[PDB]
Design a binder for this molecule. Sequence first.
Ligand SMILES: [Ca+2]
Ligand SMILES: [Ca+2]
Ligand SMILES: [Ca+2]
Ligand SMILES: [Ca+2]
Ligand SMILES: [Cl-]
Ligand SMILES: [Cl-]
Ligand SMILES: [Cl-]
Lengths: 301, 301, 301
Amino acid sequence: PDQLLEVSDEIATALAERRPVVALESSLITTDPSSETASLIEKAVRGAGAVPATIGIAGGKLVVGLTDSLIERFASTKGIPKISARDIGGALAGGGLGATTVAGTIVIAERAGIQVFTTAGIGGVHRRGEDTLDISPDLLQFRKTKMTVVSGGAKSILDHRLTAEYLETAGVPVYGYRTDKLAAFVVREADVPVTRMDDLHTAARAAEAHWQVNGPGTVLLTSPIDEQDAVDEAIVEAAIAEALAQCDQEGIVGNAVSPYLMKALARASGGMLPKAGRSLLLSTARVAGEFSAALSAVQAE
Amino acid sequence: PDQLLEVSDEIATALAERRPVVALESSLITTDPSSETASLIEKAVRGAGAVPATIGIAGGKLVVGLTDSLIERFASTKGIPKISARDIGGALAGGGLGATTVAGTIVIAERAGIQVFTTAGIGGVHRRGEDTLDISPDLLQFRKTKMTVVSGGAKSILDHRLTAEYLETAGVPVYGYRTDKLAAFVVREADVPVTRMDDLHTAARAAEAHWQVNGPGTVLLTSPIDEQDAVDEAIVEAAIAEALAQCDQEGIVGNAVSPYLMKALARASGGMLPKAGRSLLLSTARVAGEFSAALSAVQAE
Amino acid sequence: PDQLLEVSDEIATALAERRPVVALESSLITTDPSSETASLIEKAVRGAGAVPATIGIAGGKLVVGLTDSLIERFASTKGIPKISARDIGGALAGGGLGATTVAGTIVIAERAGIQVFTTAGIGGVHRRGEDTLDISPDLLQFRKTKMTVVSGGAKSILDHRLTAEYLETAGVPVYGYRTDKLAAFVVREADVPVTRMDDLHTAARAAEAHWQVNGPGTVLLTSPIDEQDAVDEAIVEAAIAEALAQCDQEGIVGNAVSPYLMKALARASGGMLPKAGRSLLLSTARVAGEFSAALSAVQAE
Ligand SMILES: [Ca+2]
Ligand SMILES: [Ca+2]
Ligand SMILES: [Ca+2]
Ligand SMILES: [Ca+2]
Ligand SMILES: [Cl-]
Ligand SMILES: [Cl-]
Ligand SMILES: [Cl-]
């Protein structure tokens, strides 16, 4: 066996039976102590017949399927570090809890044999990232790990066009589910083309041929936020450009800039930002569950 | 066997016998419906005793050695998509035709056991690419695929010095055949040093030791355009700087900029641009055929 | 056996016995013809019970443990090329001597089974590197080669914050030995956080779990220069900003800029620059020897 991995009975049975599983990250389970969200998300994933697998680090182990005991700790403990792939080693050595990010979670999901992962938005090239080189580790982790990541594109505070250019340079396939424009998190679209897939069985056959030809690597399937739930591009951009405008005059750069952009976004959105992010989270999870079903059936032939 | 790959009898026999083969891309076979070019190119490759292998996608298959029927379609069909490595999966799933680029073709060539690929110019860092991050997927595909790519350096509309810096960061060997300056497509030189190889058997022994030590990865062998056939650096640069000058005042960026640079180049060159690109294509193909012969003999010891 | 590698008896015995070995680069053995330095360095490494393995290229071979004859040549021959990983193939084919850099040496160390490498400073993103793309091949070589590199961070003429951002994007773990700020070569600190490891056995268990989960790749363990021996950040920066100020007015960019920065540094430091670099070299080598001992013991369980 594997001495680092602890996989729940349900997930281990689904994998043994080549049934559909969808991985979920823990780094944000922390952002909703309720849980109510995790419950709508599990429901969205199972509605397709997929098994949800929430992932994190605890006790020197990579945990696939957190126990209720564990979800409780992740919900209620103050000090929990966010763990990208490069932090996994130290999180294991330390023996405490670690809430894994996109890059951290997909490496653990892949190690267990899970092939689909979902979240509302991935990391990317930050705004002014062509100058500061502040770019999420998710983008190059997608050159190594065999995974389909289903999301609503990059998070809104990031630079959508630069992230799309970087993924193209990195050779990472970017598909749009029923669209040929890149999803822009709580904003419907960025003016960036992607390859339209109208059907998830076609997307799954494309992903499978991608792995067979190019080897282990991530396929990004973007699915935009429901049009009824979108935030106005103008509102998002003006709020962000102003938040950056205050950054220059108060002279803040570095890891300080990014959490200001996040708070400025909450503010401009009435109080709708959480509501829009939840809608995107739910619809993306549904698509991930349906995609994972369609991939199990493709790999079955 | 392999269920994705269709290899012609001639190429399959040369490979079985460890005889020299040189891959060619289809994405540009489309740019010369004649054929006359493809015919001079085949002649240049065979003159060294190498077998030319033109590659593309058709009918759910990776095709190595296009049939006359297929070359005809690629010559005469309007809608044919250009396929980089990240597009291979969807091109296969779709079952139509796909004309593969440098990155797309070398992955298929490698899968068949071909080790040498040639084209007039590779992709690279685009001009202003330090700011726009518009950089060809070819450069990072060279970190994965075992191949020697023989070209006249990067295409002229690209930024030669930035492409050379990026390849150095990527650990991709860059050799100059009988020169210690980087080839600049239809321009003889960029002011960028490369490692001179005066002899192709020495270059082949260097490539082989590179693969043995560093693993699968591409070696770039650059061979400049004949001095009688070069375009004046000043002519190229002035034309490009002006084409960019019009871009700023008419406010065009994105994937719009690049095809303007290409047309501005045709214009400044009298009508010699096609003539110079063909000469570079022919001399590079000859060097590729001779290199491929010298590598088969090296691997034979 | 391996036909490219020549490993001395002492190193081959330590490896066979899974005892601690630390690799050293030759590219700088050239920078101190004395030797006296190499002798203090060997002493610092052995004090921990590790075996020092100096590496280079000679006679068509990758040499692990240079002979006295070889150290003499590297000390006394004028023309010796510096060999990064991408130059290994041509250095072998040429049959002459080659002094390997960080990237070149760790690939050879890994091939022999050595897992720890040390040097005073690694390459990184050069100053203005966000615009010139001048970035050391060491940073992406760390995505491929299984190694712990122990250093005092990046060399002082480089951009510390950009190098740290680039390593984060590349997924390369960056630990600080008893510190949570990045080491800045002869300067104690850059204002850049790293993950503190207070104990080398914990660092070794983190590195081992990193390799087990993320596969072959480099772990960077940074150890700052003794506070008694540091150069004043202000002195370093003012000297560098002025050296760059003269570069703009005398219009020098390219590979010309970097050796000016190096000479301007010698000048501002009284004559202490060599003295500070030697102290950093000695203390980093000690930490490398102790780390390598602690890793052999971890891998023994
Ligand atoms: Ca960052
Ligand atoms: Ca692009
Ligand atoms: Ca810039
Ligand atoms: Ca460089
Ligand atoms: Cl794009
Ligand atoms: Cl260069
Ligand atoms: Cl950082």
